[PDB]
Design an enzyme around this catalytic site. Structure first.
Site, PDB file in Angstrom:
ATOM      1  N   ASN A  86       0.821  -1.205   0.000  1.00 43.82           N
ATOM      2  CA  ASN A  86       0.000   0.000   0.000  1.00 43.82           C
ATOM      3  C   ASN A  86       0.857   1.259   0.000  1.00 43.82           C
ATOM      4  O   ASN A  86       0.346   2.356   0.240  1.00 43.82           O
ATOM      5  CB  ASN A  86      -0.954   0.010   1.195  1.00 43.82           C
ATOM      6  CG  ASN A  86      -0.240  -0.178   2.512  1.00 43.82           C
ATOM      7  OD1 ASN A  86       0.988  -0.206   2.571  1.00 43.82           O
ATOM      8  ND2 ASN A  86      -1.008  -0.301   3.583  1.00 43.82           N
ATOM      9  N   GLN A  87       2.154   1.123  -0.265  1.00 37.89           N
ATOM     10  CA  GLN A  87       3.037   2.278  -0.299  1.00 37.89           C
ATOM     11  C   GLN A  87       2.683   3.193  -1.464  1.00 37.89           C
ATOM     12  O   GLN A  87       2.186   2.754  -2.504  1.00 37.89           O
ATOM     13  CB  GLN A  87       4.493   1.835  -0.433  1.00 37.89           C
ATOM     14  CG  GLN A  87       4.964   0.865   0.628  1.00 37.89           C
ATOM     15  CD  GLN A  87       6.447   0.574   0.515  1.00 37.89           C
ATOM     16  OE1 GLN A  87       7.278   1.468   0.659  1.00 37.89           O
ATOM     17  NE2 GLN A  87       6.786  -0.681   0.251  1.00 37.89           N
ATOM     18  N   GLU A  88       2.946   4.484  -1.275  1.00 37.31           N
ATOM     19  CA  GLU A  88       2.849   5.473  -2.347  1.00 37.31           C
ATOM     20  C   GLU A  88       1.459   5.462  -2.986  1.00 37.31           C
ATOM     21  O   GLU A  88       1.308   5.326  -4.201  1.00 37.31           O
ATOM     22  CB  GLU A  88       3.941   5.236  -3.392  1.00 37.31           C
ATOM     23  CG  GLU A  88       4.229   6.432  -4.277  1.00 37.31           C
ATOM     24  CD  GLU A  88       4.898   7.568  -3.526  1.00 37.31           C
ATOM     25  OE1 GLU A  88       5.596   7.294  -2.528  1.00 37.31           O
ATOM     26  OE2 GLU A  88       4.726   8.736  -3.935  1.00 37.31           O
ATOM     27  N   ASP A  89       0.436   5.594  -2.140  1.00 32.48           N
ATOM     28  CA  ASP A  89      -0.956   5.814  -2.533  1.00 32.48           C
ATOM     29  C   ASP A  89      -1.648   4.567  -3.065  1.00 32.48           C
ATOM     30  O   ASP A  89      -2.699   4.681  -3.700  1.00 32.48           O
ATOM     31  CB  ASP A  89      -1.076   6.934  -3.573  1.00 32.48           C
ATOM     32  CG  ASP A  89      -0.909   8.309  -2.965  1.00 32.48           C
ATOM     33  OD1 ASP A  89      -1.576   8.595  -1.950  1.00 32.48           O
ATOM     34  OD2 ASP A  89      -0.112   9.105  -3.502  1.00 32.48           O
ATOM     35  N   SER A  90      -1.109   3.378  -2.826  1.00 28.52           N
ATOM     36  CA  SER A  90      -1.790   2.144  -3.180  1.00 28.52           C
ATOM     37  C   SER A  90      -2.472   1.572  -1.939  1.00 28.52           C
ATOM     38  O   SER A  90      -2.239   2.012  -0.810  1.00 28.52           O
ATOM     39  CB  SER A  90      -0.811   1.146  -3.798  1.00 28.52           C
ATOM     40  OG  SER A  90       0.185   0.760  -2.871  1.00 28.52           O
TER      41      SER A  90
END
Ligand code: ZN
Ligand code: ZN
Ligand code: ZN
Lengths: 49, 308, 45, 42, 49, 69
Positions: free
Chosen positions: A1-5
């Site tokens: 879920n890094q960087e807007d996932s």
């Protein structure tokens, strides 16, 4: 879920979470090219078309 | 009478002629269906303008107009110079005729197919020795009548005469000439079907009923009555307009709509005496002029029709 | 012939390639093609 | 004189249709757009 | 095992947007070319480059 | 449009409680919180399933059928 996932629950998806219907419509007309040439809705055969 | 300049795609290896050929449009390939050999690659799938090569033939022209920056002097003179071209003068006559046909067809609330057929009829029938002593109004009125008939939305002579001022004699002679011309170029160069016949009365009824504001049920009954009205020899020779009007009037009084013959004949421009005269003939055969289902259900009974 | 359905009065019609597209009962000009009568399979997922 | 030809109803009908079908307010751009129906709030 | 940290956890109103990947993914090895410039055509819907 | 069969998060069956939920609200004059607990929905994942459901099928049923037998 890094960087807007994000991580989604597959079990929730299986049960119907955020499931949607999609509809698409196709339009077609029987054009008359003047007085001689005209079209018709037909199931064309490979021997005449 | 000219160079061949024809390319035929065939598989050199299979050698079978004619070949099975598949067009992989997504892959941009033409491939032999039997061996898979590719025969031609890199096949192709505003920068131009469209035109119809059936009403205008081969005539490419461009207008002159203002831009984001322009002086009226140059535009006026360039249009003045462009108008004085001798070759384009001939076709401008046809285009001017097309413009007036479009105006007449548009003031009549007619579909686009009608005006396209009318313009095509004009072009095919124009520039011939037979139609040279006839007024252009007769030519246009006849072409519109042909165009309406080809479109299955045919009109009557009186309806067209309401717009184009041409008396009956010239109208009829021109129409006969043009029909012969179209038939002549149909054989040497289709044209007609069951519709081309003059009577075709069933086509008039829906519009005539609409002018009177009757419900669709009465219109269908009128169509059935008019369709069966041709079996009686005493009425079959009458004009299709009267055949349709009297059938409509018969149904108007069958369903008991309060519309008198004085207005039915005033609306459809038909003499009231003719309506009532024809109604008498359409009274000895009523059992054959009413739909069996309507009488069977109970909607209409034949005792609601007055008898003289 | 093939079977159609009126879009306003729900009357089932049978039209040919020559017949006009219109309801013979009420006069509507929109008809719905009837659903196919061959079974269709769906996964329950 | 034919009043049916002196007045062309097509003039009013086309001018209003053309200007509303396109956004071209004449005979300004983007004055008419296809209404969004993706969702009620849209 | 317990996570050493504690998680902020609760309901939130989320919306499914119009952009789905299956309507964007597209690849081209070879395909139709434009008539004028004879280069790959434009548009995923037309097998473009 | 119609009540989901299962809770999205845990999968507990909640599609057999919609009419019971409505009846508790209407005839018993219960608050929605008490009705949810009376139906056995304890986890807030299940409570929002029944609490936030919009019954659109009732609106769709107001249109006359496309094809009547
Ligand atoms: Zn081959
Ligand atoms: Zn109907
Ligand atoms: Zn739950």
């Amino acid at each position: 879920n890094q960087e807007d996932s994000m991580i989604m629950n597959q079990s929730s998806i299986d049960r119907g979470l955020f499931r949607s219907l999609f509809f698409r419509s196709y339009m077609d007309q029987e054009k008359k090219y003047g007085m001689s040439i005209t079209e018709t809705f037909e199931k064309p055969q490979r021997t005449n078309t | 009478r000219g160079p061949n300049l024809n390319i035929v795609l065939t598989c050199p290896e299979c050698k079978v002629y004619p070949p099975k050929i598949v067009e992989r449009f997504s892959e941009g390939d033409v491939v032999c269906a039997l061996c898979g050999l590719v025969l031609s690659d890199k096949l192709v799938d505003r920068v131009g303008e469209a035109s119809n090569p059936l009403l205008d033939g081969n005539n490419l022209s461009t207008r002159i107009g203002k831009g984001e920056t322009t002086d009226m002097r140059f535009t006026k003179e360039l249009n003045k110079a462009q108008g004085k071209n001798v070759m384009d003068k001939k076709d401008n006559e046809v285009q001017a005729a097309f413009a007036k046909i479009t105006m007449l067809c548009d003031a009549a609330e007619l579909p686009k197919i009608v005006k396209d057929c009318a313009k095509e009829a004009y072009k095919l029938c124009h520039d011939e020795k037979t139609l040279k002593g006839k007024s252009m109004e007769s030519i246009m009125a006849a072409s519109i009548l042909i165009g309406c008939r080809r479109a299955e939305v045919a009109r009557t002579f009186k309806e067209i005469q309401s717009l184009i001022h041409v008396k009956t004699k010239e109208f009829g002679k021109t129409l006969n000439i043009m029909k012969n011309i179209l038939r002549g170029k149909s054989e040497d160069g289709k044209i007609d079907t069951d519709n081309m016949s003059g009577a075709q009365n069933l086509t008039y009824i829906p519009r005539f009923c609409s002018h009177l504001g009757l419900p669709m049920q009465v219109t269908t009954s009128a169509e059935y009555t008019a369709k069966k009205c041709k079996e009686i020899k005493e009425i079959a020779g009458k004009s299709p307009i009267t055949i349709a009007v009297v059938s409509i009037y018969l149904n108007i009084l069958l369903f008991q709509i309060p519309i008198t013959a004085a207005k039915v004949g005033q609306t459809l421009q038909v003499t009231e005496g003719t309506i009532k005269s024809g109604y008498k003939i359409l009274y000895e055969h009523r059992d054959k002029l009413v739909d069996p289902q309507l009488i069977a259900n109970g909607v209409v009974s034949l005792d609601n029709l007055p008898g003289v | 012939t093939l079977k159609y359905i009126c879009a306003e009065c729900s009357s089932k019609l049978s039209l040919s390639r020559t017949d006009a597209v219109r309801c013979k009962d009420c006069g509507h000009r929109i008809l719905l093609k009837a659903r196919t009568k061959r079974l269709v399979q769906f996964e329950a997922r | 004189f034919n009043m049916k030809l002196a007045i062309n109803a097509k003039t009013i009908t086309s001018g209003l249709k053309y200007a509303l079908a396109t956004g071209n307010w004449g005979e300004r751009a983007g004055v008419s757009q296809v209404l969004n129906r993706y969702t009620y709030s849209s | 095992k317990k996570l050493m940290a504690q998680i902020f956890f609760g309901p939130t109103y989320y919306q499914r947007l119009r952009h789905m990947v299956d309507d964007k993914i597209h690849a081209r090895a070879r395909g139709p070319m434009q008539v004028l410039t004879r280069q790959p055509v434009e548009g995923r819907s037309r097998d473009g480059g | 449009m119609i009540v989901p069969v299962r809770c999205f998060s845990c999968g507990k069956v909640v599609g057999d409680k919609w009419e019971s939920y409505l009846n508790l609200l209407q005839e018993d004059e219960l608050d929605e919180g008490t009705a949810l607990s009376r139906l056995g929905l304890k986890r807030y994942c299940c409570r929002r399933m029944i609490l936030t459901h919009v019954d659109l099928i009732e609106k769709f049923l107001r249109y006359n059928p496309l094809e009547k037998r």
